[PDB]
Design a protein around this nucleic acid. Sequence first.
RNA 1: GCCCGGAUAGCUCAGUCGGUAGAGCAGGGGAUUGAAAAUCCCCGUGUCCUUGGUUCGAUUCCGAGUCUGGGCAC
RNA 2: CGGAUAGCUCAGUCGGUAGAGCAGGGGAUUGAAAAUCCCCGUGUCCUUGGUUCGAUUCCGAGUCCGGGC
Lengths: 305, 303
Amino acid sequence: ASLPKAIFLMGPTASGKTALAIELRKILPVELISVDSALIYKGMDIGTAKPNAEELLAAPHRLLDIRDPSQAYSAADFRRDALAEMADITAAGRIPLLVGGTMLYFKALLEGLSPLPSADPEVRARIEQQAAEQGWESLHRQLQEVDPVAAARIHPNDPQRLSRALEVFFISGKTLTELTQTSGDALPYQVHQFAIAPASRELLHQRIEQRFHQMLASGFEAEVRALFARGDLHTDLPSIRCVGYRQMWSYLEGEISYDEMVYRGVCATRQLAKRQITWLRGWEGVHWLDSEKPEQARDEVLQVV
Amino acid sequence: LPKAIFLMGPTASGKTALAIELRKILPVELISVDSALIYKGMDIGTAKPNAEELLAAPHRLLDIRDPSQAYSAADFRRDALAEMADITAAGRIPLLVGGTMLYFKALLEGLSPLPSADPEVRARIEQQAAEQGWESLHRQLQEVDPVAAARIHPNDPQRLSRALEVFFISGKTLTELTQTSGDALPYQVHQFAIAPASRELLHQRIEQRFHQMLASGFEAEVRALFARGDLHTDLPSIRCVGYRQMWSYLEGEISYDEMVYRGVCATRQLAKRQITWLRGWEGVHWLDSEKPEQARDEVLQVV
RNA sequence: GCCCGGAUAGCUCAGUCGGUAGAGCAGGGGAUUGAAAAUCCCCGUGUCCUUGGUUCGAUUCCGAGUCUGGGCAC
RNA sequence: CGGAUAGCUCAGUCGGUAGAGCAGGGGAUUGAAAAUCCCCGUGUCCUUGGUUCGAUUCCGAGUCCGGGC
Ligand SMILES: [Ca+2]
Ligand SMILES: [Ca+2]
Ligand SMILES: [Ca+2]
Ligand SMILES: [Ca+2]
Ligand SMILES: [Ca+2]
Ligand SMILES: [Ca+2]
Ligand SMILES: [Ca+2]
Ligand SMILES: [Ca+2]
Ligand SMILES: [Ca+2]
Ligand SMILES: [Ca+2]
Ligand SMILES: [Ca+2]
Ligand SMILES: [Ca+2]
Ligand SMILES: [Ca+2]
Ligand SMILES: [Ca+2]
Ligand SMILES: [Ca+2]
Ligand SMILES: [Ca+2]
Ligand SMILES: [Ca+2]
Ligand SMILES: [Ca+2]
Ligand SMILES: [Ca+2]
Ligand SMILES: [Ca+2]
Ligand SMILES: [Ca+2]
Ligand SMILES: [Ca+2]
């Protein structure tokens, strides 16, 4: 049984992932899938570094523009959509090339996800209510009583995972620990994994500052103003929490100056890149490609496949 | 001589913030000194104190005029005097707060008795000037009043028109009439200027405050005024900062990004002229905007 | 020119009743199970502007100098 | 094929260190004042070589742009 093959092209923001995948498209029989939590949103184009129409004509990207910014996506939704796209592409005699910087998604796809309940807004509101009356420390104390192992790993000041560990208990009566000893299904594909990134760190920062000011001149403020104008989007939504968009949101709310927006936008982008690189340093199977050398990058992929 | 307080400062200075904190300590009644806050239904764009601030502190001379009605420094003078007389006859001290320095000037020093606007006579001067240019009218003024001709520049249509208007209605020239004076205040006044530490900080708070009001439904407000059908660019209300730019946006003359840019610029420039007024103002005590604690304390002492 | 204030970490600034210092932000490392561009954890780095006076000891109090921001004067 | 000069859009130096609008700064202010006016400039002329007493300018070469196959 020959396991079908796929390629992961990962990397930080401003690393030229999109550039290289579109070049790979010309010489390898591949179909591209976006692995990015922000490129999935309609009308969020400039700030997300979405490939434009002409780039999509030459190299179609699946899993772009499948959500309105008011709606939320998940590692799980990605996994289900990604698996289903990977079966079509394979059934057409092609090789799925998955490209993006959203590393939890790659991980969810590669090693599985344990089956668990999905979000419950009502249960989430309840927990948020109690945090506001008694602090998150009371909630972490509750988790100590029901799920000691989850309590130890999850820090008292991590609202997101604290809410998540309790939620799973409230919905099903079983603890997060209990459910996650059932393991995720591994990806039934032979996968070649690459991570392309700038030679050094000083240079990663330089390209990020450049790519931010590039966006500003591309009409980024206008894009975010349209979103801002709708009236039904708010900073608790994943899309508005995106890098660039969140700081521009403060700006449009009159909470910071233009220069403070610019400062905090770039910083958030550097902070993104840094966390993407952390994932990649601990990742297993990675072939490293040099961002500032796209020609060798292309040839290195070719001769590893 | 009964006493009074001037609290003067540029836009985005925390005037109202301080006024409401003074109202808790000294026995005092606020009077708004502002060419724009007089107008009904112009609330967001003008930085009008909200209905909550108005409950803590009553402000007089707010929302006394429909936007189709021109106010004037003389109308302010009459109303402020009449209101000071109530506050004084009621045991309290008038605290006039705001950023319209000509209005403060007229009140303290007095205006000389002249004729008011005659719109027909203004119609003829604006008609003559379109046919014969603004130099010929200036020439006309030099022939009959040399002194104002030397002071009023040929490219200043408002003051030139006014100088000629005073003569056309009266027969007496502006110089002749401005020889009689005010009518200064019969009050012992304590004058305060409240401004930020630096010009960069003032600019930055101005940008911020303008985006604040956009996000609070400023365009909807101006849409309502635009809805009416009787208001136009020659009215004092629609020439206000923010409102005038939003007016061009609503006429389809400029984009939204352009409206925002010109609005911020127009508000920076307003603030600049406001502190030009205050620099050199006699007897004024300066206060820092960013130090509200130290601010309040200096006022309490001086009085 | 005169008067007032500021000067301390890569940035904003707190503080040291005179015993040579710490917050946020930036930067570094790490965690990561249906919000992940999210949410968290851990770690840095000082001629305390210069100089003189008082002092056992001064970044701190005092004087002077320099740079910066205001006001006043033109 | 083109463009790179002020915070922004740009003009200009027949080779001798540069203006225009806008922004910005200073000023005036007598019934429209959030109005109406007046005054002032903001400089590694992208980098590097060549030619030159002198190059931002002329001529190469680099780099970034925006356009044409
Ligand atoms: Ca003055
Ligand atoms: Ca003066
Ligand atoms: Ca230093
Ligand atoms: Ca500093
Ligand atoms: Ca300090
Ligand atoms: Ca001590
Ligand atoms: Ca940090
Ligand atoms: Ca000594
Ligand atoms: Ca010393
Ligand atoms: Ca000292
Ligand atoms: Ca100064
Ligand atoms: Ca330019
Ligand atoms: Ca040119
Ligand atoms: Ca010449
Ligand atoms: Ca010049
Ligand atoms: Ca100007
Ligand atoms: Ca006068
Ligand atoms: Ca100069
Ligand atoms: Ca040269
Ligand atoms: Ca050249
Ligand atoms: Ca091209
Ligand atoms: Ca073409």
